[PDB]
Amino acid sequence: SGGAGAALGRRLLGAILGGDPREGLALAKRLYEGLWMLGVDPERGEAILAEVRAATGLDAEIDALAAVMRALNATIIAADEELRAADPAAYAAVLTFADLVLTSKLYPEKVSPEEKKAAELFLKGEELIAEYLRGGPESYLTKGKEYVAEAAKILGLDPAQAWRGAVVHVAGSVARTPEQAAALAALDRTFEEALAAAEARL
């Protein structure tokens, strides 16, 4: 039991994947899309969740889960909001990377070989930034920058702007408490697994 987020996820997923497990699988994925976006891009996340709320009728639970997410990702939202306002070019690079990562994970067929490679490279760069911030050797930051710059080059983004955005965004994520990170990981596990079982029915 992962906390409020996972409890609300269990309820919502049971209703969506119950009955039609083909058009329910697509709705469940779209719900995950909205929740994942609340941190990095609140306007985009709320839009998708509004769509899903109109499709399912589970107003109380979707509205409540949005609130839990804003709480769990409060440090990421604040960091990314200041980043957007101070540095729209850097924030545009993180929005691009985030949308690429989410699509690589939910709808891999929508991703080309190069963009998929950029997604892998960026995620390795993000990991090294985060583990620098969590105590790793300074060479983690050097190598992290090499990954981000190469992913930026692939996508035609400017590496200096991509890097600013990546470091600020990761810093906002690393600043979550371990309780918040555990809650988010529990919600994440809830989705990945219910979507596994619904990948056996289809």
Author numbering: -1 to 200
Which text from the study accompanies this structure?
To demonstrate the general applicability of Riff-Diff to design enzymes, we selected the Morita–Baylis–Hillman (MBH) reaction as a second model system. The second active site was taken from BH1.8, the MBHase with the highest activity to date. We determined Michaelis–Menten parameters for MBH18 and MBH48, the designs that showed the highest conversion after 8 h for their respective catalytic array. With a kcat of 0.025 min−1, MBH48 activity is 1.5 times higher than in BH32.8 (kcat of 0.0168 min−1), a variant that emerged after screening 13,590 clones in 8 rounds of directed evolution. However, it remains 45-fold less active than BH1.8 23H (kcat of 1.13 min–1), a BH1.8 variant with a regular histidine residue instead of Nδ-methylhistidine. Additionally, by-product formation in MBH48 is minimal. CD experiments confirmed the expected helical fold of MBH48, the most active MBHase design, with an unfolding onset at around 85 °C. The crystal structure of MBH48 agrees with its design model (Cα RMSD 0.78 Å), and the desired catalytic geometry was reproduced with a sidechain RMSD of 1.07 Å. Such precision might explain the high catalytic activity, however, our results show that high activity cannot be inferred from precise reproduction of the apo-state alone.
Here we present rotamer inverted fragment finder–diffusion (Riff-Diff), a hybrid machine learning and atomistic modelling strategy for scaffolding catalytic arrays in de novo proteins. We highlight the general applicability of Riff-Diff by designing enzymes for two mechanistically distinct chemical transformations, the retro-aldol reaction and the Morita–Baylis–Hillman reaction. We show that in both cases, it is possible to generate catalysts that exhibit activities rivalling those optimized by in vitro evolution, along with exquisite stereoselectivity. High-resolution structures of six of the designs revealed near-atomic active site design precision.
